[PDB]
Write a protein that binds this DNA or RNA. Structure first.
Lengths: 337, 62, 132
RNA sequence: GCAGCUUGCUACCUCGAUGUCGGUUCUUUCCAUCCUGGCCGUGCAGCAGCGGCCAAGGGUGAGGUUGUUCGCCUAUUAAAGGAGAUCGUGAGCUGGGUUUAGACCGUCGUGAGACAGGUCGGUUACUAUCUACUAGAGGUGCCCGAGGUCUGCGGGUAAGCUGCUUUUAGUACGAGAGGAACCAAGCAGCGGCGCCACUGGUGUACCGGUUGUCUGACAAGGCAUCGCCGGGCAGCUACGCGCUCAGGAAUAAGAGCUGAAUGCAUCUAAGCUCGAACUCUGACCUAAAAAGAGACCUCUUUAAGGAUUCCGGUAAAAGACCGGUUUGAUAGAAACGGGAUGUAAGCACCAAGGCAACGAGGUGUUCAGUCCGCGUUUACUAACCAUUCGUUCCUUUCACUU
RNA sequence: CCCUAACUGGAGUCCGGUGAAGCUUACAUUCUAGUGCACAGUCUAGAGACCUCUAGGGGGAAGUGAAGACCCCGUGGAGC
RNA sequence: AGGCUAAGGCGUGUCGGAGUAAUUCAGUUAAGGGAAUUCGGCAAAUUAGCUCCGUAACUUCGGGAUAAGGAGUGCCUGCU
């Protein structure tokens, strides 16, 4: 038999396609430190999409210098609290948590997530971590941070979300000093990301529940006469006669969406403080209006509205210093029109 | 930023939205929405359609 | 080829009988294949504005008819977006006979051409009376 | 000699049936490699060929005839390679062919009838027991009791592949004709992942027009596929939109260094440097049920905290998940904002005309009327009342109390 | 059909009531290779595998339905 | 005929239900292309009543024929 070839339906790069074990994306890698100390990640909540008219500043592009309409995602980004500093020791079996110091004073609504750590050992915990770093038991340092969604109104929840973030510094001592400076403080998104820079966005995608292989993997439907013989939206064959089994690579029904996904190289087009600049007439549908500080991300982002979106400094960015975008018009017309 | 007027309802095309429709004779018409495009393609005239500015002008002519 | 500023949906697939709108003697040409287009299994060859297709002259003069020629689509009813966010659509689909290089066999083009084809092939623009 | 993918030979298995060809759908494998990557030779100037070696990561398409496999032909294309999987795949599909009963033509036969000849027509059964897989849960094990944040034993991946154009450059090369390569840029085809500002579809919410008929007429309504027709918000969706280089290590073929056996020479016998779309790492997903069953911190040990009830939705087939619960805007009402439709009923004037009664319809009242599975404001009603576990149960085999 | 999308009613899915049938020597959480009447979940050597439940399409059980209607044989028949 | 209604006969032969997922039986609609699908336009879609105009090859002179191909159509006022 002389066969016609096709690329495989869907990607096996995301198998098993199960539901994410948490509603928060977890970062498995952190990029290289390339400058002054700072947090490598922030976290906001997706609001919705709008579009801007901007001058194409992208070097070498055909439309560079002319007016272009660019879709943007609005992400409401209230200040996060640096709740703790955690130290990690590297050994043959990998990284292990070795020490943690919690900030002396923490927000009372953190009790919705965890019983509040007391204002106990912070000075001696920090000196213990300093001794550990001096004696070489510490491989690196991360900052445990959490969001404060109570200030938002389109997100109904008041329980904070907690996550670890890397610190970008040239040396472990510099990392420890910066973490001590930022410990217990409220960091704004301008203290993590700058306008016009590329970032990576992680989020839990839109949940679709249980979906068939046609929607879930993009398999072809039965065609022509076969379309009305009783197996229309349904895979042609589960396998060969031998091997006597259904491969895991055969497209099948199952959970669709509500997965963790990372998008790369999303450009920040605006860091705003007043949500009236971006909120349309009538508000964002099912969300409301922006009230705190916000961010405009060029293009689309994984997740629906109100989903927690984690932003991190780019890990596979190609282009060098991009610049500050020239946003000439932010559309606030009614999205419900 | 080109400022464009809807041919049917006479409303300004908001930037990044709207349509331009070209006939065989080179005639160009800006449409603010699918509603205006559909009403233009139905043969309805704006001056007879009341919710458009041309219909409003025709009515206020009296 | 040179990139166009607009995003063009490949609207016309193989078998479409398009009116030919130059003075070459071809009235209706059927798309046979699309140049520089590699497909996938079961997918018909697809062409939008700015694409060059191999066509067969179905109507027109007897000298043009049954000839395999090259044509460039200059008008398409499927809407395409300009870089600045405005969507453009024509009242009909229309093509013009050209060579491999992009030169039109005709001398005048009745009807408006798309600015995308007018820029990708500058001679189509000069041959056309108006560029929309 | 190899393979067993052609056809034979054989008759070991199956005749208390292993459903027969081809196509379609989907998955996988081989390399004897068509293209893509790296090389060597050339009767290799360049362009482009011819021959061979490594390499299976990706690709290998669209169409006309024919049931076809095969083959022929067409236009694209980097190329449109071949083969295995019960000639993969009928408890997936199809039924064109072959392989039933009917009939015709030709040829055999006196005949019934026959033909690896042709032709027309000719039923494709089943509620899944086990196993396998895809997803979702409840337990038990691990474990001070609970919660949170992590690690990564491992698993998977194409953590993309490939063209066109510009430039290099009308340059190297070449007498000319012709005509490259490194780097750089953009775009495109296919693939992957996500998203809905824009555009398109749908939108049996909703709004309007109108046909037939019924409720006595008007108004308001029922029915006729949502009666039909036009429009359409939210939502979903693609025909729309965003993102989707690498670098390093170690290698294959191969090219070299040093270097003896073999005073010299030698890429090889040790040793050493390079060297691919391969492999590994690296930017992705998953992963304490990793039995070596993990690390850290916090809280609290009749507690922490969990579940149930309540109001919900970023979630959802059941479960589960994520939130709020008066110290509250979770949902609903009211109003307003923002939208959909298209100017309501009644009233007045006009109306072709009619002696009049009437009069389709037009204009004003009136961007009206109706509606909103969106937002805001607002505790106005409902998030109240509680239950249950964290105690082996009865007991005084008690850390207790009548 | 390219290439599928949304929606409508009935099933399905979840709940209350009612309530059959068909495969079944046994055991059974399997996978690879070999062996074996040369087409193994059970043999041999490895590799995996904590149990239970729900949904789902049918890879396998050479699945079930049926003393093969093709071929041969029977000094078995029937019709012509 | 079909639709909507009388009279007369009936609600008579399982319910509920939280998006009530995927899938499936039967339907509505679908941008651009329009048979490229497929053995084959199978299925689906197009046209459709009545009036008027007009109607070919061929023919056994009967027909072909509703050939083909065009135009009109509602309501109101007054009439022949």
């Amino acid at each position: 038999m002389a066969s016609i070839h096709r690329p495989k339906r869907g990607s096996l790069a995301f198998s098993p396609r199960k539901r994410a074990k948490s509603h928060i994306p977890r970062f498995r890698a952190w990029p290289e430190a390339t400058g002054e100390p700072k947090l490598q990640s922030f976290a906001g909540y997706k609001v919705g999409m709008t579009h801007v008219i901007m001058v194409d500043d992208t070097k070498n592009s055909l439309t560079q210098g002319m007016e272009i309409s660019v879709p943007v995602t609005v992400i409401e980004t209230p200040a996060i609290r640096v709740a703790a500093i955690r130290a990690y020791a590297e050994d043959s079996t990998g990284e292990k948590a070795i020490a943690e110091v919690w900030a002396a004073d923490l927000d009372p609504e953190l009790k919705r997530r965890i019983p509040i750590p007391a204002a106990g050992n912070q000075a001696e915990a920090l000196e213990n971590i300093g001794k550990l770093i001096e004696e070489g038991r510490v491989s690196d340092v991360r900052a445990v941070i959490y969001t404060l969604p109570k200030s938002l109104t389109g997100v109904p929840k008041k329980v904070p979300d907690i996550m670890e973030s890397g610190i970008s510094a040239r040396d472990l001592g510099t990392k420890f000093e910066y973490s001590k400076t930022i410990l217990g403080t409220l960091v704004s998104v301008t203290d993590v990301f700058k306008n016009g820079t590329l970032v990576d966005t992680a989020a839990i995608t839109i949940g679709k529940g249980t979906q068939g292989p046609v929607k879930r993997w993009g398999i072809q439907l039965m065609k022509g006469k076969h379309s009305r013989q009783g197996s229309l939206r349904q895979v042609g064959t589960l396998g060969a006669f031998n091997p006597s089994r259904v491969s895991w690579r055969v497209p099948q029904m199952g959970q669709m969406g509500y997965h963790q996904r990372t998008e790369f190289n999303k450009r920040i087009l605006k860091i705003g403080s007043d949500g009236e600049e971006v909120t349309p007439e009538g508000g964002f549908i099912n969300y409301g209006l922006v009230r705190g500080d916000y961010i405009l991300i060029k293009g689309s982002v994984p997740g629906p509205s109100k989903r927690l979106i984690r932003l991190r400094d780019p890990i596979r960015a190609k282009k060098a210093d991009l610049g500050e975008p020239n946003i000439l018009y932010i559309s606030r017309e009614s999205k419900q029109g | 930023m080109e400022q464009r007027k809807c041919y049917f309802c006479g409303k300004m095309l908001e930037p990044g939205t709207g349509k331009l429709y070209v006939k065989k004779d080179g005639s160009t018409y800006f449409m603010c929405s699918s509603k205006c495009m559909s009403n233009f393609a139905l043969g309805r005239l704006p001056r007879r359609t009341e919710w458009t500015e041309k219909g409003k002008i025709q009515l206020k002519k009296a | 080829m040179k990139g166009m500023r607009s995003n063009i949906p490949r609207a016309l697939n193989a078998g479409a009988q398009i009116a030919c709108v130059d003075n070459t003697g071809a009235k209706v040409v059927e798309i046979i294949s699309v140049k520089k287009y590699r497909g996938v299994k079961n997918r018909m060859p697809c062409a939008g504005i700015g694409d060059m297709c191999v066509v067969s002259v179905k109507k027109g003069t007897p000298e043009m008819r049954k000839q395999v020629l090259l044509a460039v689509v200059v008008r398409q009813k499927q809407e395409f977006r300009r870089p600045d966010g405005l969507h453009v659509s024509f009242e009909d689909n229309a093509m013009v006979i050209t060579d491999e290089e992009g030169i039109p066999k005709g001398t005048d083009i009745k009807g408006p051409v798309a600015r995308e084809v007018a820029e990708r092939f500058p001679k189509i623009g000069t041959t056309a009376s108006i560029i929309v």
